[PDB]
């Protein structure tokens, strides 16, 4: 009789690497790495996301009328651009500080869109209906943006324009506007009847005098002129004044904004579904508790951390050695 002493053994074959040795077959282990994900993009914390489709963000906020379907959108979890998202600006030009605008979008949650200057009332001086381009056409019909307003003269006449606007909505208000210029002096007089012209934008902290330019250039989309774009955050209290002579693209819609951080500009093309998670990638959604994520670095939510490895098995057990 004897009391021979020994340890447990298994039939398992998961291997853990150590420093002194590779591929050690251990009894029991525990994973620490993730790779599983659906190919779906679910809502975050119950709140639906937003998809633009074939729409750049700038084309959406200006209301490029190919982006007409998502007109009544007001609340999102995170904005999804697509690979096919290309309807930016219809009229050729330049949207100044587009990047800074996109990061100020990254901490807004919802909207209150409203008429700034009511088109039937605010303009008792000028023809506000004979201005459109065929380059920004829509189903054949010559069309225009949905938040702006082209302004024309009224029968070889121009009263000098001035207009204020006040904030009394508590939250901050974002206001856009634009400046047109043609490439020829003849067209410049043909629309505006002024040798020189100027606008001025002033609130308290933004202030600039704008003046057009007239210069020939190769046309794009059948248009040789250009149009620049500008935008400013307002505050409660402080007011804004526009004062125009020749080249005004009048604001016609504003936005009241809402806080609540962590918004994203994830670009993917996986479809949208209607479950709920706490983590979201371009390649899918996650559901885990291991502290290391391997799928993709760009995350939204409370996600575990991105690494660049393959196998991170941690051994909790013995050297499984048969006899």
């Amino acid at each position: 009789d004897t009391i021979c002493v020994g340890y447990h053994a298994n039939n398992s074959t998961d291997t853990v690497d150590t420093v002194l040795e590779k591929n050690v077959t251990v009894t029991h282990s525990v994973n620490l790495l993730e790779d599983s994900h659906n190919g779906k993009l679910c809502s975050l914390n119950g709140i639906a996301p937003l998809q633009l489709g074939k729409c750049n963000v700038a084309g959406w906020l200006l209301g490029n009328p190919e982006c007409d379907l998502l007109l009544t959108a007001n609340s999102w979890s995170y904005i999804i651009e697509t690979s096919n998202s290309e309807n930016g600006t219809c009229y050729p030009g330049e949207f100044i500080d587009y990047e800074e605008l996109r990061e100020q979008l990254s901490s807004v949650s919802s909207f209150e869109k409203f008429e700034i200057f009511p088109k039937a009332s605010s303009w008792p001086n000028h023809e506000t209906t004979k201005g459109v381009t065929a380059a920004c056409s829509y189903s054949g019909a010559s069309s225009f943006y949905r938040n702006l307003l082209w302004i024309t003269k009224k029968g070889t006449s121009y009263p000098k324009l001035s207009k204020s606007y006040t904030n009394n909505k508590g939250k901050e208000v974002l206001v856009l506007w634009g400046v047109h210029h043609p490439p020829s002096v003849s067209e410049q007089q043909s629309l505006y009847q002024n040798a020189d012209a100027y606008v001025s934008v002033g609130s308290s902290k933004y202030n600039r005098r704008f003046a057009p330019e007239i210069a020939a250039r190769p046309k794009v989309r059948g248009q040789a002129g250009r149009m620049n774009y500008y935008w400013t955050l307002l505050d409660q209290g402080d007011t804004i004044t526009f004062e125009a002579t020749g080249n005004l693209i009048a604001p016609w819609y504003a936005f009241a904004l809402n806080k609540g951080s962590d918004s994203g500009i994830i670009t993917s093309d996986a479809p949208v579904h209607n479950c709920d998670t706490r983590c979201q990638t371009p390649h899918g959604a996650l559901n885990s508790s291991l502290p290391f994520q391997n799928v993709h670095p760009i995350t939204i939510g409370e996600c575990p951390k991105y690494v660049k490895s393959t196998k991170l098995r941690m051994a909790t057990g013995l050297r499984n050695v048969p006899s």
Binding site: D1, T2, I3, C4, V5, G6, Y7, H8, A9, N11, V16, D17, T18, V19, L20, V24, V30, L32, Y98, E99, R102, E103, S106, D262, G264, I265, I266, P291, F292, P297, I298, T299, I300, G301, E302, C303, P304, K305, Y306, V307, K308, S309, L312, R313, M314, A315, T316, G317, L318, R319, N320, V321, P322, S323
Partner: protein, 203 residues
């Protein structure tokens, strides 16, 4: 710091053991062993569980990080951002793999030390009995039932209760032919030789 017990002086494992990680195999009068030791293995389970929970605790959870945008004039800032990202990525993958490797070394040696400590504890409470052989196996000079087995597994042995029969029993095991010759030396064989001398002297 491989202590040389597992795959050392003890070769293999036990498949017939089920319950814990550390156990015995008694081979007494009736029945056989493969009875676990739930006492010591509980400490192992608690320590490893604390270790794993601590490692999961020391890593944080990052929050929403989105790629940014630039035009065609901000290239310095763009490479700056890219450099920051690849730097932090390399640092965290370095930390992760190095940490898991060193933890795996130390946990295998923790199991080895537990095995060796149990073997030390067993041999310590058996003073001069059982004449151990090989991979931790014994003889038990005095014959005893399940009860001494269960006592020793509970760390109780009462060595003077068995000492005298085991001492005599060891000594008669220590007797090879010394049960047959008992002249305190090679004397029993030796006595016959002198006789021949006396018989030839008085012959």
């Amino acid at each position: 710091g491989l202590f040389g017990a597992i795959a050392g002086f003890i070769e293999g494992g036990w498949t017939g053991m089920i319950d814990g990680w550390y156990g015995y195999h008694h081979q007494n009068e009736q029945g056989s062993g493969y009875a676990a030791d739930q006492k010591s293995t509980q400490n192992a389970i608690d320590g490893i569980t604390s270790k794993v929970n601590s490692v999961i605790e020391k890593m944080n959870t990052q929050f929403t990080a989105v790629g940014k945008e630039f035009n065609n004039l901000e290239r310095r800032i763009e490479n700056l951002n890219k450099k920051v990202d690849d730097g932090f990525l390399d640092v965290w993958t370095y930390n992760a793999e190095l940490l898991v490797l060193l933890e795996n070394e130390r946990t295998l040696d923790f199991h080895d030390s537990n095995v060796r400590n149990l073997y030390e504890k067993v041999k310590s409470q058996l003073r001069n009995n059982a004449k151990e052989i090989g991979n931790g196996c014994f003889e038990f000079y005095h014959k005893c039932d399940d009860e001494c087995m269960e006592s020793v597994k509970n760390g109780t042995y009462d060595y003077p209760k068995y000492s005298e029969e085991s001492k005599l029993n060891r000594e008669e095991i220590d007797g090879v032919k010394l049960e047959s010759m008992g002249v305190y030396q090679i004397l029993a064989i030796y006595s016959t030789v002198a006789s021949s001398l006396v018989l030839l002297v008085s012959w």
